[PDB]
Amino acid sequence: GFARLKRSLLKTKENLGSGFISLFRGKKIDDDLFEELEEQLLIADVGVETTRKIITNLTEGASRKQLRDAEALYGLLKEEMGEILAKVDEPLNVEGKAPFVILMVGVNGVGKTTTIGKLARQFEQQGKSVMLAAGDTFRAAAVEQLQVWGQRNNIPVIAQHTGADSASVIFDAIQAAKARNIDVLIADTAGRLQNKSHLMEELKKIVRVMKKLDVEAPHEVMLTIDASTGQNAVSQAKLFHEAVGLTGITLTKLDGTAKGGVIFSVADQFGIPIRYIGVGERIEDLRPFKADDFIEALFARED
Amino acid sequence: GFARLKRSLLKTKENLGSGFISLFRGKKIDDDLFEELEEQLLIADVGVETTRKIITNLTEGASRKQLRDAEALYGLLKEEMGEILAKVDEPLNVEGKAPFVILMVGVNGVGKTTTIGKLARQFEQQGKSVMLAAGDTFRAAAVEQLQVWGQRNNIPVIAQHTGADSASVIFDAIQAAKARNIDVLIADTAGRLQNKSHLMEELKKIVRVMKKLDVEAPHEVMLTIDASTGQNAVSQAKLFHEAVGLTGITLTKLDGTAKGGVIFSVADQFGIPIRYIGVGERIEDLRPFKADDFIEALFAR
Ligand code: NA
Ligand code: NA
Ligand code: NA
Ligand code: NA
Ligand code: NA
Ligand code: NA
Ligand code: NA
Ligand code: NA
Protein backbone atom coordinates (compact mmCIF):
# COMPACT_ATOMS: atom_id res chain seq x y z
CA GLY A 1 0.00 0.00 0.00
CA PHE A 2 0.75 3.73 -0.09
CA ALA A 3 2.91 3.18 -3.17
CA ARG A 4 2.63 6.81 -4.31
CA LEU A 5 3.81 8.20 -0.97
CA LYS A 6 6.50 5.50 -0.80
CA ARG A 7 7.85 6.81 -4.12
CA SER A 8 7.74 10.40 -2.85
CA LEU A 9 9.71 9.31 0.24
CA LEU A 10 12.13 7.01 -1.62
CA LYS A 11 15.26 8.95 -0.66
CA THR A 12 14.10 9.47 2.93
CA LYS A 13 13.40 5.73 3.27
CA GLU A 14 17.10 5.03 2.69
CA ASN A 15 17.83 6.18 6.27
CA LEU A 16 14.49 6.14 8.13
CA GLY A 17 11.69 3.63 8.50
CA SER A 18 12.37 0.71 6.17
CA GLY A 19 15.93 2.07 6.11
CA PHE A 20 16.36 0.86 9.69
CA ILE A 21 16.04 -2.78 8.60
CA SER A 22 19.55 -3.11 7.16
CA LEU A 23 20.93 -1.19 10.16
CA PHE A 24 19.58 -3.68 12.71
CA ARG A 25 19.98 -6.90 10.73
CA GLY A 26 22.03 -9.42 12.69
CA LYS A 27 23.09 -7.01 15.45
CA LYS A 28 22.79 -7.08 19.23
CA ILE A 29 21.25 -4.34 21.36
CA ASP A 30 24.11 -2.53 23.11
CA ASP A 31 25.64 0.92 23.47
CA ASP A 32 27.31 0.62 20.05
CA LEU A 33 23.95 -0.02 18.39
CA PHE A 34 22.24 2.98 19.99
CA GLU A 35 25.20 5.19 19.06
CA GLU A 36 24.91 4.10 15.42
CA LEU A 37 21.14 4.63 15.47
CA GLU A 38 21.52 8.09 17.03
CA GLU A 39 23.97 9.05 14.27
CA GLN A 40 21.59 7.85 11.57
CA LEU A 41 18.66 9.80 13.03
CA LEU A 42 20.81 12.94 13.17
CA ILE A 43 22.01 12.51 9.58
CA ALA A 44 18.32 12.18 8.65
CA ASP A 45 17.69 15.66 10.16
CA VAL A 46 15.54 14.37 13.04
CA GLY A 47 17.24 16.91 15.32
CA VAL A 48 19.28 16.65 18.50
CA GLU A 49 16.44 17.07 21.00
CA THR A 50 13.96 14.79 19.23
CA THR A 51 16.66 12.18 18.61
CA ARG A 52 17.64 12.22 22.30
CA LYS A 53 14.03 11.59 23.30
CA ILE A 54 13.66 8.70 20.85
CA ILE A 55 16.91 7.08 22.02
CA THR A 56 16.03 7.51 25.70
CA ASN A 57 12.60 5.92 25.30
CA LEU A 58 13.84 3.17 22.98
CA THR A 59 16.72 2.26 25.32
CA GLU A 60 14.47 2.02 28.38
CA GLY A 61 11.85 0.00 26.50
CA ALA A 62 14.38 -2.48 25.13
CA SER A 63 15.91 -2.90 28.59
CA ARG A 64 12.64 -3.32 30.49
CA LYS A 65 11.28 -5.72 27.87
CA GLN A 66 14.63 -7.58 27.94
CA LEU A 67 14.92 -7.43 24.15
CA ARG A 68 17.91 -9.28 22.71
CA ASP A 69 17.99 -8.76 18.93
CA ALA A 70 18.28 -5.34 17.30
CA GLU A 71 15.63 -6.36 14.75
CA ALA A 72 12.98 -5.83 17.43
CA LEU A 73 13.86 -2.13 17.67
CA TYR A 74 12.14 -1.69 14.32
CA GLY A 75 8.63 -2.12 15.78
CA LEU A 76 9.34 0.00 18.87
CA LEU A 77 10.70 2.86 16.53
CA LYS A 78 7.53 2.66 14.42
CA GLU A 79 5.48 3.16 17.59
CA GLU A 80 7.57 6.02 18.95
CA MET A 81 7.94 7.89 15.66
CA GLY A 82 4.33 7.19 14.68
CA GLU A 83 3.08 8.77 17.90
CA ILE A 84 5.17 11.88 17.19
CA LEU A 85 3.34 12.41 13.90
CA ALA A 86 -0.10 11.36 15.16
CA LYS A 87 0.08 14.16 17.74
CA VAL A 88 0.13 16.76 14.93
CA ASP A 89 -2.49 15.11 12.71
CA GLU A 90 -5.40 17.53 12.37
CA PRO A 91 -6.66 18.72 8.97
CA LEU A 92 -7.51 22.36 8.40
CA ASN A 93 -11.24 23.17 8.46
CA VAL A 94 -12.04 26.42 6.62
CA GLU A 95 -15.83 26.07 6.70
CA GLY A 96 -18.39 28.52 7.99
CA LYS A 97 -16.63 31.91 8.07
CA ALA A 98 -17.15 35.11 6.09
CA PRO A 99 -14.32 35.02 5.24
CA PHE A 100 -12.08 32.41 6.81
CA VAL A 101 -8.74 34.26 6.98
CA ILE A 102 -5.48 32.36 6.51
CA LEU A 103 -2.38 34.40 7.32
CA MET A 104 0.50 32.77 5.44
CA VAL A 105 3.84 33.29 7.17
CA GLY A 106 7.34 32.01 6.53
CA VAL A 107 10.51 33.01 4.73
CA ASN A 108 10.50 33.90 1.05
CA GLY A 109 10.62 30.83 -1.17
CA VAL A 110 8.94 28.87 -3.92
CA GLY A 111 7.17 26.81 -1.26
CA LYS A 112 5.16 29.61 0.32
CA THR A 113 4.23 31.20 -3.01
CA THR A 114 3.25 27.89 -4.60
CA THR A 115 1.29 26.80 -1.51
CA ILE A 116 -0.93 29.90 -1.66
CA GLY A 117 -1.84 29.08 -5.25
CA LYS A 118 -2.47 25.38 -4.64
CA LEU A 119 -4.66 26.02 -1.60
CA ALA A 120 -6.63 28.67 -3.50
CA ARG A 121 -7.27 26.22 -6.34
CA GLN A 122 -8.24 23.43 -3.93
CA PHE A 123 -10.71 25.66 -2.09
CA GLU A 124 -12.26 26.70 -5.41
CA GLN A 125 -12.68 23.06 -6.45
CA GLN A 126 -14.47 22.61 -3.11
CA GLY A 127 -16.99 25.28 -4.17
CA LYS A 128 -15.54 28.20 -2.19
CA SER A 129 -14.86 31.71 -3.42
CA VAL A 130 -11.26 32.76 -2.74
CA MET A 131 -9.46 36.10 -2.53
CA LEU A 132 -5.74 36.80 -2.08
CA ALA A 133 -3.99 39.67 -0.30
CA ALA A 134 -0.55 40.76 -1.53
CA GLY A 135 0.92 41.59 1.87
CA ASP A 136 4.59 41.24 0.83
CA THR A 137 4.45 44.91 -0.01
CA PHE A 138 8.13 45.87 -0.47
CA ARG A 139 8.92 43.14 -3.04
CA ALA A 140 7.42 44.52 -6.25
CA ALA A 141 8.27 41.41 -8.27
CA ALA A 142 6.52 39.16 -5.73
CA VAL A 143 3.41 41.37 -5.71
CA GLU A 144 3.24 41.43 -9.52
CA GLN A 145 3.64 37.66 -9.78
CA LEU A 146 0.75 37.18 -7.35
CA GLN A 147 -1.34 39.60 -9.41
CA VAL A 148 -0.36 37.72 -12.58
CA TRP A 149 -1.33 34.40 -10.99
CA GLY A 150 -4.67 35.80 -9.85
CA GLN A 151 -5.44 37.14 -13.32
CA ARG A 152 -4.51 33.82 -14.95
CA ASN A 153 -6.81 31.96 -12.53
CA ASN A 154 -9.58 34.58 -12.24
CA ILE A 155 -9.06 34.92 -8.49
CA PRO A 156 -9.09 38.49 -7.10
CA VAL A 157 -5.86 39.87 -5.64
CA ILE A 158 -5.84 42.89 -3.32
CA ALA A 159 -2.64 44.92 -3.65
CA GLN A 160 -1.28 48.42 -3.08
CA HIS A 161 1.74 50.39 -4.26
CA THR A 162 5.26 49.19 -3.55
CA GLY A 163 6.12 50.01 0.05
CA ALA A 164 2.53 50.18 1.29
CA ASP A 165 1.78 49.17 4.86
CA SER A 166 1.17 45.42 4.90
CA ALA A 167 -1.36 45.67 7.73
CA SER A 168 -3.34 48.22 5.70
CA VAL A 169 -3.30 46.03 2.57
CA ILE A 170 -4.56 43.04 4.55
CA PHE A 171 -7.17 45.14 6.38
CA ASP A 172 -8.47 46.40 3.03
CA ALA A 173 -8.46 42.82 1.73
CA ILE A 174 -10.62 41.60 4.63
CA GLN A 175 -13.04 44.47 4.00
CA ALA A 176 -13.20 43.60 0.30
CA ALA A 177 -13.65 39.90 1.10
CA LYS A 178 -16.56 40.64 3.44
CA ALA A 179 -18.13 43.05 0.95
CA ARG A 180 -17.87 40.50 -1.89
CA ASN A 181 -19.08 37.38 -0.02
CA ILE A 182 -15.67 35.69 -0.14
CA ASP A 183 -15.40 32.34 1.67
CA VAL A 184 -11.61 32.21 2.15
CA LEU A 185 -9.07 35.04 2.18
CA ILE A 186 -5.42 33.99 1.95
CA ALA A 187 -3.02 36.75 2.98
CA ASP A 188 0.59 36.68 1.86
CA THR A 189 3.21 38.33 4.07
CA ALA A 190 6.82 39.40 3.87
CA GLY A 191 9.49 36.79 4.51
CA ARG A 192 12.75 38.74 4.39
CA LEU A 193 15.71 37.40 6.33
CA GLN A 194 17.47 40.60 7.42
CA ASN A 195 16.44 42.27 10.68
CA LYS A 196 14.22 39.53 12.09
CA SER A 197 12.70 41.74 14.80
CA HIS A 198 11.31 44.12 12.16
CA LEU A 199 9.45 41.30 10.41
CA MET A 200 7.99 40.02 13.68
CA GLU A 201 6.75 43.48 14.65
CA GLU A 202 5.21 43.74 11.17
CA LEU A 203 3.36 40.44 11.64
CA LYS A 204 2.07 41.42 15.09
CA LYS A 205 0.70 44.65 13.62
CA ILE A 206 -1.09 42.75 10.84
CA VAL A 207 -2.81 40.56 13.43
CA ARG A 208 -3.85 43.46 15.68
CA VAL A 209 -5.34 45.46 12.79
CA MET A 210 -7.49 42.49 11.71
CA LYS A 211 -9.36 42.47 15.02
CA LYS A 212 -11.20 45.70 14.18
CA LEU A 213 -13.06 43.73 11.48
CA ASP A 214 -13.26 40.27 13.07
CA VAL A 215 -11.98 39.27 16.51
CA GLU A 216 -11.66 35.69 15.20
CA ALA A 217 -9.29 36.68 12.40
CA PRO A 218 -6.81 35.34 11.51
CA HIS A 219 -8.61 31.99 11.80
CA GLU A 220 -5.40 30.18 10.77
CA VAL A 221 -1.78 31.33 10.98
CA MET A 222 -0.04 28.92 8.59
CA LEU A 223 3.73 28.56 8.37
CA THR A 224 5.24 27.18 5.16
CA ILE A 225 8.62 25.46 5.45
CA ASP A 226 10.70 23.47 2.98
CA ALA A 227 11.77 19.96 4.00
CA SER A 228 14.83 20.17 1.72
CA THR A 229 16.24 22.95 3.95
CA GLY A 230 16.81 20.57 6.87
CA GLN A 231 17.18 22.18 10.27
CA ASN A 232 16.58 25.63 8.75
CA ALA A 233 12.91 24.62 8.69
CA VAL A 234 13.03 24.02 12.45
CA SER A 235 14.71 27.34 13.27
CA GLN A 236 12.25 29.17 11.00
CA ALA A 237 9.32 27.48 12.75
CA LYS A 238 10.74 28.50 16.14
CA LEU A 239 11.17 32.11 15.03
CA PHE A 240 7.65 32.55 13.64
CA HIS A 241 5.92 30.58 16.40
CA GLU A 242 7.54 32.60 19.19
CA ALA A 243 6.71 35.89 17.44
CA VAL A 244 3.12 35.54 16.17
CA GLY A 245 1.85 32.10 17.18
CA LEU A 246 1.25 29.43 14.57
CA THR A 247 -1.86 27.29 14.29
CA GLY A 248 -0.83 25.16 11.29
CA ILE A 249 2.19 24.13 9.26
CA THR A 250 2.66 23.18 5.61
CA LEU A 251 5.85 21.24 4.86
CA THR A 252 6.80 21.33 1.17
CA LYS A 253 9.24 19.48 -1.06
CA LEU A 254 9.17 16.16 0.78
CA ASP A 255 9.49 14.33 -2.55
CA GLY A 256 13.01 13.73 -3.82
CA THR A 257 14.81 14.88 -0.65
CA ALA A 258 16.78 12.70 1.76
CA LYS A 259 15.91 15.21 4.51
CA GLY A 260 12.27 14.20 5.03
CA GLY A 261 13.10 13.20 8.61
CA VAL A 262 12.83 16.87 9.59
CA ILE A 263 9.05 16.36 9.82
CA PHE A 264 9.68 14.55 13.12
CA SER A 265 11.64 17.50 14.53
CA VAL A 266 8.92 19.99 13.52
CA ALA A 267 6.20 17.79 15.01
CA ASP A 268 7.96 17.01 18.29
CA GLN A 269 9.48 20.43 19.03
CA PHE A 270 6.34 22.55 18.54
CA GLY A 271 3.25 20.32 18.64
CA ILE A 272 1.54 22.47 15.99
CA PRO A 273 -0.74 20.61 13.54
CA ILE A 274 0.86 19.81 10.20
CA ARG A 275 -2.02 20.62 7.87
CA TYR A 276 -0.49 19.75 4.48
CA ILE A 277 2.58 18.10 3.00
CA GLY A 278 3.88 18.79 -0.49
CA VAL A 279 4.85 15.58 -2.27
CA GLY A 280 4.64 16.58 -5.93
CA GLU A 281 4.09 19.25 -8.54
CA ARG A 282 0.34 18.98 -9.06
CA ILE A 283 -2.27 20.95 -7.15
CA GLU A 284 -3.47 17.64 -5.70
CA ASP A 285 0.08 16.80 -4.55
CA LEU A 286 -0.29 19.29 -1.71
CA ARG A 287 -1.95 16.65 0.44
CA PRO A 288 -3.73 16.90 3.78
CA PHE A 289 -1.28 15.39 6.23
CA LYS A 290 -2.27 11.91 7.45
CA ALA A 291 0.14 10.61 10.07
CA ASP A 292 -0.86 6.97 9.65
CA ASP A 293 -0.34 7.03 5.87
CA PHE A 294 3.04 8.69 6.39
CA ILE A 295 4.39 6.27 9.00
CA GLU A 296 3.20 3.23 7.02
CA ALA A 297 4.79 4.52 3.81
CA LEU A 298 8.00 5.31 5.68
CA PHE A 299 8.38 2.02 7.56
CA ALA A 300 6.85 -0.60 5.24
CA ARG A 301 9.32 -2.36 2.96
CA GLU A 302 6.66 -3.73 0.62
CA ASP A 303 5.37 -1.47 -2.17
CA GLY B 1 1.73 5.44 -12.52
CA PHE B 2 -1.66 7.06 -11.98
CA ALA B 3 -1.38 9.08 -15.20
CA ARG B 4 -0.93 5.97 -17.36
CA LEU B 5 -3.95 4.42 -15.65
CA LYS B 6 -6.17 7.37 -16.60
CA ARG B 7 -6.47 6.16 -20.20
CA SER B 8 -7.42 2.63 -19.13
CA LEU B 9 -10.18 3.96 -16.86
CA LEU B 10 -11.73 6.59 -19.17
CA LYS B 11 -15.00 4.68 -19.56
CA THR B 12 -15.29 4.14 -15.79
CA LYS B 13 -14.54 7.84 -15.19
CA GLU B 14 -17.77 8.78 -16.99
CA ASN B 15 -19.71 7.75 -13.86
CA LEU B 16 -17.12 7.57 -11.06
CA GLY B 17 -14.39 9.89 -9.84
CA SER B 18 -14.24 12.90 -12.14
CA GLY B 19 -17.69 11.83 -13.35
CA PHE B 20 -19.08 13.09 -10.03
CA ILE B 21 -18.10 16.70 -10.76
CA SER B 22 -21.08 17.60 -12.94
CA LEU B 23 -23.40 15.93 -10.43
CA PHE B 24 -22.35 18.24 -7.56
CA ARG B 25 -21.90 21.51 -9.49
CA GLY B 26 -23.99 24.29 -7.98
CA LYS B 27 -26.09 22.02 -5.76
CA LYS B 28 -26.91 21.96 -2.07
CA ILE B 29 -26.33 18.96 0.18
CA ASP B 30 -29.72 17.34 0.77
CA ASP B 31 -31.63 14.08 0.37
CA ASP B 32 -32.21 14.72 -3.34
CA LEU B 33 -28.46 15.04 -3.90
CA PHE B 34 -27.67 11.77 -2.12
CA GLU B 35 -30.41 10.01 -4.09
CA GLU B 36 -28.88 11.25 -7.35
CA LEU B 37 -25.45 10.07 -6.20
CA GLU B 38 -26.87 6.66 -5.28
CA GLU B 39 -28.31 6.28 -8.78
CA GLN B 40 -24.95 7.09 -10.38
CA LEU B 41 -23.01 4.69 -8.14
CA LEU B 42 -25.44 1.87 -8.92
CA ILE B 43 -25.29 2.35 -12.70
CA ALA B 44 -21.49 2.15 -12.33
CA ASP B 45 -21.92 -1.38 -10.85
CA VAL B 46 -20.70 -0.38 -7.37
CA GLY B 47 -23.35 -2.69 -5.90
CA VAL B 48 -26.33 -2.10 -3.62
CA GLU B 49 -24.62 -2.82 -0.31
CA THR B 50 -21.38 -0.94 -1.05
CA THR B 51 -23.28 2.02 -2.50
CA ARG B 52 -25.34 2.28 0.68
CA LYS B 53 -22.18 2.26 2.82
CA ILE B 54 -20.59 4.98 0.68
CA ILE B 55 -23.69 7.19 0.89
CA THR B 56 -24.03 6.69 4.65
CA ASN B 57 -20.38 7.51 5.36
CA LEU B 58 -20.48 10.50 3.01
CA THR B 59 -23.62 11.84 4.69
CA GLU B 60 -22.10 11.49 8.17
CA GLY B 61 -18.81 13.04 7.05
CA ALA B 62 -20.50 16.03 5.42
CA SER B 63 -22.51 16.62 8.60
CA ARG B 64 -19.45 16.24 10.83
CA LYS B 65 -17.46 18.74 8.74
CA GLN B 66 -20.48 21.09 8.40
CA LEU B 67 -20.15 21.30 4.63
CA ARG B 68 -22.32 23.77 2.72
CA ASP B 69 -21.58 23.16 -0.97
CA ALA B 70 -22.08 19.85 -2.75
CA GLU B 71 -18.79 20.50 -4.56
CA ALA B 72 -17.01 19.77 -1.27
CA LEU B 73 -18.38 16.21 -1.29
CA TYR B 74 -15.95 15.35 -4.09
CA GLY B 75 -12.92 15.22 -1.79
CA LEU B 76 -14.80 13.26 0.88
CA LEU B 77 -15.84 10.71 -1.75
CA LYS B 78 -12.25 10.40 -2.96
CA GLU B 79 -11.18 9.80 0.62
CA GLU B 80 -13.90 7.27 1.46
CA MET B 81 -13.79 5.37 -1.84
CA GLY B 82 -9.96 5.45 -1.66
CA GLU B 83 -10.24 3.89 1.91
CA ILE B 84 -12.28 0.98 0.42
CA LEU B 85 -9.42 0.16 -1.95
CA ALA B 86 -6.66 0.90 0.56
CA LYS B 87 -8.00 -1.94 2.73
CA VAL B 88 -7.21 -4.47 -0.04
CA ASP B 89 -3.93 -2.89 -1.21
CA GLU B 90 -1.47 -5.46 0.26
CA PRO B 91 0.93 -6.55 -2.53
CA LEU B 92 1.50 -10.23 -3.20
CA ASN B 93 4.89 -11.35 -1.85
CA VAL B 94 6.00 -14.72 -3.28
CA GLU B 95 9.45 -14.80 -1.69
CA GLY B 96 11.03 -17.14 0.78
CA LYS B 97 9.13 -20.41 0.30
CA ALA B 98 10.13 -23.75 -1.21
CA PRO B 99 7.97 -23.36 -3.20
CA PHE B 100 5.47 -20.56 -2.70
CA VAL B 101 2.25 -22.19 -3.96
CA ILE B 102 -0.42 -20.16 -5.76
CA LEU B 103 -3.69 -22.02 -6.29
CA MET B 104 -5.56 -20.22 -9.08
CA VAL B 105 -9.34 -20.55 -8.82
CA GLY B 106 -12.28 -19.22 -10.67
CA VAL B 107 -14.92 -20.10 -13.34
CA ASN B 108 -14.12 -21.25 -16.98
CA GLY B 109 -14.07 -18.25 -19.44
CA VAL B 110 -12.35 -15.66 -17.27
CA GLY B 111 -8.82 -16.29 -18.56
CA LYS B 112 -7.34 -18.19 -15.61
CA THR B 113 -4.81 -20.06 -17.77
CA THR B 114 -3.55 -16.99 -19.62
CA THR B 115 -3.31 -15.08 -16.34
CA ILE B 116 -1.19 -17.90 -14.88
CA GLY B 117 1.14 -17.74 -17.87
CA LYS B 118 1.50 -13.97 -17.67
CA LEU B 119 2.34 -14.13 -13.95
CA ALA B 120 4.76 -17.02 -14.54
CA ARG B 121 6.62 -14.99 -17.17
CA GLN B 122 6.70 -11.96 -14.87
CA PHE B 123 8.12 -13.98 -11.97
CA GLU B 124 10.75 -15.51 -14.27
CA GLN B 125 11.76 -12.09 -15.61
CA GLN B 126 12.22 -11.12 -11.95
CA GLY B 127 14.75 -13.94 -11.50
CA LYS B 128 12.52 -16.51 -9.80
CA SER B 129 12.32 -20.17 -10.77
CA VAL B 130 8.74 -21.08 -11.66
CA MET B 131 6.83 -24.31 -12.18
CA LEU B 132 3.26 -24.75 -13.43
CA ALA B 133 0.70 -27.45 -12.64
CA ALA B 134 -2.04 -28.28 -15.16
CA GLY B 135 -4.80 -28.96 -12.64
CA ASP B 136 -7.67 -28.29 -15.09
CA THR B 137 -7.29 -31.91 -16.03
CA PHE B 138 -10.37 -32.57 -18.20
CA ARG B 139 -9.79 -29.60 -20.54
CA ALA B 140 -7.05 -30.51 -23.01
CA ALA B 141 -6.95 -26.98 -24.44
CA ALA B 142 -6.23 -25.55 -20.99
CA VAL B 143 -3.41 -28.05 -20.44
CA GLU B 144 -1.97 -27.26 -23.87
CA GLN B 145 -2.17 -23.50 -23.29
CA LEU B 146 -0.20 -23.86 -20.06
CA GLN B 147 2.34 -26.07 -21.86
CA VAL B 148 2.73 -23.38 -24.54
CA TRP B 149 3.68 -20.83 -21.88
CA GLY B 150 6.09 -23.32 -20.32
CA GLN B 151 7.74 -24.31 -23.60
CA ARG B 152 8.22 -20.71 -24.77
CA ASN B 153 9.87 -19.75 -21.46
CA ASN B 154 11.67 -22.97 -20.43
CA ILE B 155 9.36 -23.27 -17.41
CA PRO B 156 8.44 -26.84 -16.40
CA VAL B 157 4.77 -27.82 -16.61
CA ILE B 158 3.46 -30.80 -14.65
CA ALA B 159 0.58 -32.51 -16.44
CA GLN B 160 -1.14 -35.89 -16.73
CA HIS B 161 -3.53 -37.47 -19.21
CA THR B 162 -6.91 -35.90 -19.92
CA GLY B 163 -9.24 -36.81 -17.07
CA ALA B 164 -6.50 -37.33 -14.47
CA ASP B 165 -7.18 -36.51 -10.83
CA SER B 166 -6.38 -32.83 -10.28
CA ALA B 167 -5.27 -33.43 -6.69
CA SER B 168 -2.77 -36.02 -7.92
CA VAL B 169 -1.35 -33.68 -10.57
CA ILE B 170 -0.88 -30.91 -8.02
CA PHE B 171 0.59 -33.29 -5.43
CA ASP B 172 3.15 -34.48 -7.98
CA ALA B 173 3.85 -30.86 -8.93
CA ILE B 174 4.62 -29.82 -5.35
CA GLN B 175 6.92 -32.82 -4.93
CA ALA B 176 8.70 -31.95 -8.19
CA ALA B 177 8.96 -28.29 -7.17
CA LYS B 178 10.64 -29.22 -3.88
CA ALA B 179 12.99 -31.65 -5.65
CA ARG B 180 14.02 -29.00 -8.20
CA ASN B 181 14.41 -26.02 -5.82
CA ILE B 182 11.50 -24.11 -7.39
CA ASP B 183 10.63 -20.71 -5.92
CA VAL B 184 7.02 -20.40 -7.14
CA LEU B 185 4.48 -23.04 -8.20
CA ILE B 186 1.25 -21.88 -9.88
CA ALA B 187 -1.58 -24.43 -10.19
CA ASP B 188 -4.48 -24.11 -12.64
CA THR B 189 -7.83 -25.65 -11.66
CA ALA B 190 -11.18 -26.70 -13.08
CA GLY B 191 -13.92 -24.11 -13.32
CA ARG B 192 -17.31 -25.63 -14.18
CA LEU B 193 -20.14 -23.95 -12.24
CA GLN B 194 -22.75 -26.43 -13.49
CA ASN B 195 -22.15 -28.44 -10.28
CA LYS B 196 -20.95 -25.91 -7.72
CA SER B 197 -20.61 -28.42 -4.88
CA HIS B 198 -18.49 -30.72 -7.05
CA LEU B 199 -16.14 -27.87 -7.98
CA MET B 200 -15.74 -26.65 -4.40
CA GLU B 201 -15.16 -30.19 -3.11
CA GLU B 202 -12.50 -30.70 -5.79
CA LEU B 203 -10.73 -27.52 -4.67
CA LYS B 204 -10.95 -28.51 -1.00
CA LYS B 205 -9.47 -31.91 -1.87
CA ILE B 206 -6.59 -30.19 -3.69
CA VAL B 207 -5.95 -28.09 -0.59
CA ARG B 208 -6.02 -31.09 1.75
CA VAL B 209 -3.54 -32.93 -0.46
CA MET B 210 -1.24 -29.88 -0.50
CA LYS B 211 -1.13 -29.71 3.30
CA LYS B 212 0.21 -33.26 3.58
CA LEU B 213 3.36 -31.92 1.89
CA ASP B 214 3.49 -28.42 3.45
CA VAL B 215 1.02 -27.15 6.05
CA GLU B 216 1.52 -23.62 4.70
CA ALA B 217 0.43 -24.58 1.18
CA PRO B 218 -1.36 -23.11 -0.64
CA HIS B 219 0.32 -19.85 0.38
CA GLU B 220 -2.06 -17.90 -1.87
CA VAL B 221 -5.52 -18.87 -3.10
CA MET B 222 -5.99 -16.42 -5.97
CA LEU B 223 -9.30 -15.79 -7.72
CA THR B 224 -9.38 -14.43 -11.26
CA ILE B 225 -12.48 -12.42 -12.16
CA ASP B 226 -13.39 -10.32 -15.19
CA ALA B 227 -14.43 -6.73 -14.50
CA SER B 228 -16.46 -6.57 -17.73
CA THR B 229 -18.87 -9.18 -16.30
CA GLY B 230 -20.16 -6.73 -13.70
CA GLN B 231 -21.88 -8.28 -10.71
CA ASN B 232 -21.04 -11.78 -11.99
CA ALA B 233 -17.52 -11.05 -10.75
CA VAL B 234 -18.94 -10.31 -7.30
CA SER B 235 -21.11 -13.43 -7.17
CA GLN B 236 -18.18 -15.57 -8.33
CA ALA B 237 -15.98 -14.10 -5.60
CA LYS B 238 -18.66 -14.81 -3.00
CA LEU B 239 -19.00 -18.44 -4.10
CA PHE B 240 -15.29 -19.26 -3.94
CA HIS B 241 -14.58 -17.19 -0.83
CA GLU B 242 -17.40 -18.65 1.29
CA ALA B 243 -16.69 -22.22 0.15
CA VAL B 244 -12.88 -22.38 0.00
CA GLY B 245 -11.45 -19.08 1.25
CA LEU B 246 -9.56 -16.61 -0.95
CA THR B 247 -6.39 -14.71 -0.07
CA GLY B 248 -5.93 -12.69 -3.27
CA ILE B 249 -7.78 -11.45 -6.34
CA THR B 250 -6.73 -10.64 -9.90
CA LEU B 251 -9.29 -8.44 -11.68
CA THR B 252 -8.95 -8.41 -15.47
CA LYS B 253 -10.43 -6.45 -18.38
CA LEU B 254 -10.69 -3.09 -16.60
CA ASP B 255 -9.70 -1.19 -19.74
CA GLY B 256 -12.64 0.13 -21.87
CA THR B 257 -15.58 -1.29 -19.63
CA ALA B 258 -17.90 1.19 -17.93
CA LYS B 259 -18.22 -1.46 -15.18
CA GLY B 260 -14.86 -0.79 -13.50
CA GLY B 261 -16.79 0.40 -10.45
CA VAL B 262 -17.23 -3.28 -9.56
CA ILE B 263 -13.74 -3.13 -8.02
CA PHE B 264 -15.29 -1.24 -5.09
CA SER B 265 -17.91 -3.95 -4.58
CA VAL B 266 -15.27 -6.69 -4.65
CA ALA B 267 -13.06 -4.76 -2.22
CA ASP B 268 -15.80 -3.78 0.24
CA GLN B 269 -17.83 -7.00 0.29
CA PHE B 270 -14.97 -9.44 0.91
CA GLY B 271 -11.89 -7.52 2.07
CA ILE B 272 -9.57 -9.81 0.09
CA PRO B 273 -6.40 -8.13 -1.26
CA ILE B 274 -6.55 -7.24 -4.94
CA ARG B 275 -3.09 -8.32 -6.08
CA TYR B 276 -3.17 -7.48 -9.80
CA ILE B 277 -5.34 -5.60 -12.28
CA GLY B 278 -5.51 -6.20 -16.02
CA VAL B 279 -5.67 -3.12 -18.24
CA GLY B 280 -4.89 -4.87 -21.53
CA GLU B 281 -4.19 -8.21 -23.12
CA ARG B 282 -0.37 -8.12 -23.01
CA ILE B 283 1.89 -9.54 -20.30
CA GLU B 284 2.91 -5.99 -19.40
CA ASP B 285 -0.75 -4.96 -19.05
CA LEU B 286 -1.18 -7.21 -15.97
CA ARG B 287 -0.04 -4.75 -13.30
CA PRO B 288 0.38 -5.01 -9.52
CA PHE B 289 -2.62 -3.27 -8.00
CA LYS B 290 -1.86 0.09 -6.38
CA ALA B 291 -5.02 1.47 -4.78
CA ASP B 292 -3.68 5.02 -4.60
CA ASP B 293 -2.71 5.05 -8.29
CA PHE B 294 -6.21 3.78 -9.08
CA ILE B 295 -8.02 6.42 -7.01
CA GLU B 296 -5.77 9.22 -8.27
CA ALA B 297 -6.44 8.23 -11.89
CA LEU B 298 -10.18 7.86 -11.29
CA PHE B 299 -10.58 11.20 -9.47
CA ALA B 300 -8.09 13.26 -11.48
CA ARG B 301 -9.66 16.57 -12.51
NA1 NA C 1 14.81 17.99 17.37
NA1 NA D 1 -17.19 40.67 13.30
NA1 NA E 1 -28.95 15.45 3.97
NA1 NA F 1 -1.28 -2.94 -3.66
NA1 NA G 1 11.29 -19.68 -14.09
NA1 NA H 1 -0.99 -20.42 -24.33
NA1 NA I 1 5.80 -15.82 -23.42
NA1 NA J 1 -3.29 -22.28 3.13
Numbering used by the authors:
A (entry chain A): 195 to 497
B (entry chain B): 195 to 495
Please quote the paper that reports this structure.
The signal recognition particle (SRP) is an efficient protein sorting system that directs the translocation of newly synthesized proteins from translating ribosomes to the endoplasmic reticulum (ER) or plasma membrane. The N domain of FtsYNG consists of a four-helix bundle (αN1−N4), while the G domain adopts a classical Ras GTPase fold in which five conserved motifs (G1−G5) are arranged around the nucleotide-binding site.
Apo FtsYNG crystals diffracted to 1.45Å with two copies of the protein in the asymmetrical unit. Also an unique αβαβ domain to the SRP GTPase family named Insertion Box Domain (IBD) is present in the G domains and is involved in 4.5S RNA recognition and interaction with Ffh as previously reported. The apo structure was then used as a search model for all subsequent FtsYNG:fragment structures (herein referred to as holo structures) using molecular replacement.
